Symmetry: C3
């Protein structure tokens, strides 16, 4: 069997429409089979002094399906090696959002600046279902 | 059709009981259709110097259903604009928890204090299913 | 009925194989019924000055099932009390990963060092399903 056939056990897996606003970057991909996230690239060069943060363009936009959420998580390697984090982690991408995904990077190292270059992988994007809960206000939890 | 009718495609959507311990705040709501989270308010005024953190009352309590988790995520706007983050993000709200949701806000800006006023939206609350996994200890992964 | 019988409503609950690389630590457990996470221990003593971070061994390895993700979240108590956080939170554990779970702890307090002792609970591990999305590149979202 070739690629185009959806294997049985992946019949149900979901699709995510994506637009490369920056066509010069590779499409986000999973580094390994079963990996939770696809790796987002930086569209830009940016240098972050200790304690500084930046809102960095990834060059993509996505259409998260209704009933789901996209989540932007930090890469573990850079987090440890150089103290790179994401201010609003986990970044919450709503089903209705059709703008460019931007990553609020922050340098949590005390002394060493972090240089990010265009084309570097700077975060990962997961997609999960979410319960769009209906609030039921009660006067006490007994009542419910 | 009017509001009270549960549309077909939302027959299965879950309910979340909530108690406004602070009845003076609006109920948390989704800013847009399909948004992953409902926006939590601060019950209080608080001022956070750079690097400082506070445990801020939201004026609500919830009953996350068994088999699910509530998750407190930072708002992207404040995160970028002013460096506001959440120390324990993502905040983990257990199914059994019936206390007030409190938000561990922290100012990650190097120089500018953040002022939060009562009634400001300071986080978002998502609800997701969680696998309540049964651990199976093995001596090596082959064995399993 | 005794323990070994899987109750009806937990017929479907998933298993997580785990190896204690450090057999001297307790197995991670849920502190209460319905808790989202199991509590990870530190295998080691470590002292974190303000602003410093460390990659701390938990003494376990796990096999997250294909179609799921493990997620390492900070404990709320330590986060508030002493400013302890996790640089890459939420830590993303892929289905394929068979190495030791390590926690990138960071001291976000301005002045007081944090001492972690072997055997202390330093994070929690959740397991959730994840959508292993198939990207569909489009030239505009209309097109899709
Ligand atoms: O908190 C964590 C996160 C990850 N890990 C392990 C499990 C995970 O599958 C593996 C890779 O993690 P990330 O994808 O978060 N980091 P990065 O993208 O830098 O490394 P890789 O190229 O291996 O994916 O590291 C941990 O032990 N603790
Ligand atoms: O890391 C992120 C997070 C969000 N976003 C986009 C997608 C999301 O749907 C939109 C709104 O995000 P938040 O709800 O996290 N922030 P805030 O509540 O300040 O803005 P809004 O009023 O638009 O919801 O911003 C990103 O590009 N990157
Ligand atoms: O952001 C949060 C996180 C938790 N909480 C409440 C709900 C949760 O079920 C309870 C315990 O949270 P954690 O497990 O995250 N922290 P810790 O492990 O220190 O406390 P406990 O021993 O109670 O689990 O604290 C909040 O109000 N806000
Ligand atoms: Mg990775
Ligand atoms: Mg929002
Ligand atoms: Mg706990």
């Amino acid at each position: 069997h070739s690629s185009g056939l959806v294997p049985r056990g992946s019949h149900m897996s979901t699709t995510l429409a994506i637009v490369r606003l920056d066509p010069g970057l590779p499409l986000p991909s999973r580094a390994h089979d079963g990996d939770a996230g696809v790796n987002l690239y930086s569209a830009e060069d940016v240098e972050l002094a200790p304690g500084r943060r930046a809102l960095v363009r990834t060059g993509v936009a996505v259409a998260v399906p209704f009933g789901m959420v996209g989540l932007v998580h930090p890469r573990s390697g850079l987090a440890t090696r150089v103290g790179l984090s994401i201010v609003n982690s986990p970044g919450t991408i709503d089903a209705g959002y059709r703008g460019e995904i931007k990553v609020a990077l922050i340098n949590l190292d005390p002394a060493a600046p972090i240089v990010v270059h265009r084309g570097d992988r700077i975060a990962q994007l997961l997609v999960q279902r979410v319960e769009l809960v209906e609030l039921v206000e009660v006067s006490s939890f007994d009542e419910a």
